[PDB]
């Protein structure tokens, strides 16, 4: 499955951990409050985070403070509220990692109270 696919949430809904770890792009699942439900191997290759240990943490408060901004967290909460989350933009990640330019795609999941954040290098 390709980053930015129109029905990416359908494909990923069918995947287990190993399959999510096989994706070409970083994939995080958050609940509506921003707590991390899932975090794949490709994401940890970009950020230096251990996917096994960031589970349960809050993405915006603790893990990724640079994303606590109208440009990222603001768009997340707008989409959670509207129920339409599906948005793409560029960003730079730089907390406890080398500053890294990325493309981000956020999209609501099919499962309850879950939201995908997809990331690739640019």
For ligand HC4, the binding residues (CB under 6 A) are: 28, 43, 47, 49, 63-67, 93-95
First CA to last CA across the chain, in angstroms? 18
Residue 8: exposed, middle, or buried by beta-carbon count in 10 A (0-12, 13-18, 19+)?
A: buried
Residue whose beta carbon is closest to ligand HC4: 66
Residues 10-48: b if buried by 16+ CB within 10 A, e if exposed: eebeebeeeebbebebbbbbbbeebbbbbbbbbbbebbe
**Smallest separation (angstroms) from ligand HC4 to the CB of 19:** 19
**Smallest separation (angstroms) from ligand HC4 to the CB of 102:** 8
Quick one: 38 or 47, whose CB is closer to ligand HC4?
47
């Amino acid at each position: 499955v390709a980053f930015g696919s129109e029905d990416i949430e359908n494909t990923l809904a069918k995947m287990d951990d190993g399959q999510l770890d096989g994706l070409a792009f970083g994939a995080i699942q958050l609940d509506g409050d921003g707590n991390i439900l899932q975090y794949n191997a490709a994401q940890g290759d970009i950020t230096g985070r251990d996917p096994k240990q960031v589970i349960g943490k809050n993405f915006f408060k603790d893990v990724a403070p640079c994303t606590d901004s109208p440009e990222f967290y603001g768009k997340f909460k707008e989409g959670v509220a509207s129920g339409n989350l599906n948005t793409m933009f560029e960003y730079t990640f730089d907390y406890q990692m080398t500053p890294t330019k990325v493309k981000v795609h956020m999209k609501k999941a099919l499962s309850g109270d879950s939201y995908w954040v997809f990331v690739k290098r640019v």
